[PDB]
Amino acid sequence: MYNFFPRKPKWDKNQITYRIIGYTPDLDPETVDDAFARAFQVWSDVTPLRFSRIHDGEADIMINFGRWEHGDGYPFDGKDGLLAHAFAPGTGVGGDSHFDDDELWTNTSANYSLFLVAAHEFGHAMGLEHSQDPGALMAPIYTYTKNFRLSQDDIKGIQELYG
Numbered sequence: 001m002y003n004f005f006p007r008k009p010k011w012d013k014n015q016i017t018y019r020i021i022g023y024t025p026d027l028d029p030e031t032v033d034d035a036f037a038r039a040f041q042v043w044s045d046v047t048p049l050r051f052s053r054i055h056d057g058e059a060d061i062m063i064n065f066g067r068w069e070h071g072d073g074y075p076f077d078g079k080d081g082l083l084a085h086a087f088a089p090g091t092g093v094g095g096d097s098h099f100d101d102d103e104l105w106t107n108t109s110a111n112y113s114l115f116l117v118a119a120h121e122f123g124h125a126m127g128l129e130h131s132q133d134p135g136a137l138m139a140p141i142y143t144y145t146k147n148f149r150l151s152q153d154d155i156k157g158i159q160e161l162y163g
């Protein structure tokens with residue numbers, strides 16, 4: 001068994017299952033659907049990962065909102081600030097991402113762009129963590145995609161984490 005682990009079998013296997021717990025209205029429903037598929041390819045384009053969407057057998061990664069209550073450690077906030085987040089890798093809880101409730105995400109000329117806000121959370125849902133690099137994707141600063149630019153910093157972390 002390689003070595004001992006912290007009980008949680010860190011996610012690490014092709015074929016992934018994900019299910020949004022509730023599309024958002026700020027943008028088209030079929031649009032949020034595309035912003036996620038594109039995003040899927042935005043991160044799958046850097047590795048032969050296989051994503052599978054479900055809607056009845058639950059999913060390893062569960063997406064939704066943050067709500068005002070929640071309990072995490074920062075209820076409500078509106079404005080930019082917290083835009084979303086996910087829990088460490090694991091089963092059920094590991095792989096879920098929460099998006100800000102009162103906000104305006106859209107695949108149009110909005111500002112957060114479901115494809116962008118998700119991309120970032122599409123990297124955290126995995127395991128990589130902020131590396132301090134500002135020009136990185138996991139960087140601690142929100143950078144809109146005026147030209148969608150990737151970064152090996154991720155191709156590398158996702159390379160040893162997958163291919």
Ligand SMILES: CCCCCc1ccc(C(=O)Nc2ccc(S(=O)(=O)N(CCN3CCOCC3)[C@@H](C(=O)NO)C(C)C)cc2)cc1
Nearest residue numbers: 081082083084085120124136137139140141142143145149
């Ligand atoms: C498309 C390719 C181009 C990529 C460019 C590119 C480059 C950098 C970024 C970027 O930095 N995005 C981003 C950063 C923070 C948050 S956030 O406010 O929810 N947030 C941080 C909030 N805050 C500051 C630092 O982290 C701790 C506290 C949460 C978090 O880490 N989620 O993963 C946490 C609160 C859970 C959300 C998105 C995006 C695109």
Ligand SMILES: [Ca+2]
Nearest residue numbers: 078079080082
């Ligand atoms: Ca917010």
Ligand SMILES: [Ca+2]
Nearest residue numbers: 093094095096
């Ligand atoms: Ca999960």
Ligand SMILES: [Zn+2]
Nearest residue numbers: 066070072098
């Ligand atoms: Zn949460």
Ligand SMILES: [Zn+2]
Nearest residue numbers: 120124130138
């Ligand atoms: Zn982050």
